């Protein structure tokens, strides 16, 4: 069983075009993942204080 860094180098990290392709795909997916995680950390820290936390008693 090949190691996963060896598999990563053989499939994606060898050719520079595939390197840039996986860089961009990882950029998109990682931007989504950290946007979700960072906002979730923020509202968990600031639960009960934000406007969307207190919003539900004023629309309806």
């Amino acid at each position: 069983s090949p190691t996963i860094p060896s598999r990563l180098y053989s499939l994606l990290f060898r050719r520079t075009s595939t390197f840039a392709l996986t860089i961009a795909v990882g950029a998109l997916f990682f931007e989504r993942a950290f946007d979700q995680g960072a906002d979730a950390i923020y509202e968990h820290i600031n639960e009960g204080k934000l406007w969307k936390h207190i919003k539900h008693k004023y629309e309806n």
């Binding site: 860094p5 053989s10 990290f13 390197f19 961009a24």
Partner: protein, 164 residues
């Protein structure tokens, strides 16, 4: 090599993400501000428009002509065919309210504002390159490529019109 290039790939993903965000910060900073988005909704036109007259106001930052139309003007607009102009359009499909017509006064050749109450068709006469327009803004005699845009308005109670 996979471990080293994995470190390089993750840090250049982080750098590209940060660069994308800061360039978007700059581009959104050069975009429209909160105040000019706030005055993107025009004020109330009320019922100060005279009979058969037009008024030019600042709606969405641009010149908007709100003009009162008569029964003869409505009959002429109905008698004007749809496909007889440069583009297929009708006055009934253009303006819901036949008494008052609200349009964005920007011509379709160089983006000038036409002079109201002028022209041989009874509408407007934009003199930058000589385009005449009817009561609905249809191009009959002129070099304008398209027709005059009609803004998407809303009508509250009879003294209140919300245009934006």
């Amino acid at each position: 090599k996979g471990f080293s290039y994995l470190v390089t790939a993750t840090t250049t993903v982080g750098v590209a993400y940060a660069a994308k965000n800061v360039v978007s910060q700059f581009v959104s900073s050069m975009s429209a501000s909160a105040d000019v988005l706030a005055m993107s909704k025009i004020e109330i036109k009320l019922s100060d428009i005279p009979e058969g007259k037009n008024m030019a106001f600042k709606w969405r930052g641009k010149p908007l002509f709100v003009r009162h139309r008569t029964k003869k003007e409505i009959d002429q607009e109905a008698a004007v065919e749809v496909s007889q102009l440069r583009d297929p359009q009708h006055d009934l499909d253009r303006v819901k309210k036949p008494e008052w017509v609200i349009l964005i006064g920007v011509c379709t050749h160089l983006g000038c504002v036409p002079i109201a109450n002028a022209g041989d068709f009874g509408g407007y006469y934009c003199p930058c390159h000589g385009s005449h327009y009817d009561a609905s803004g249809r191009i009959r005699k002129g070099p304008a490529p398209l027709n005059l845009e009609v803004p998407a308005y809303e009508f509250t109670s009879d003294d209140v019109v919300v245009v934006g």
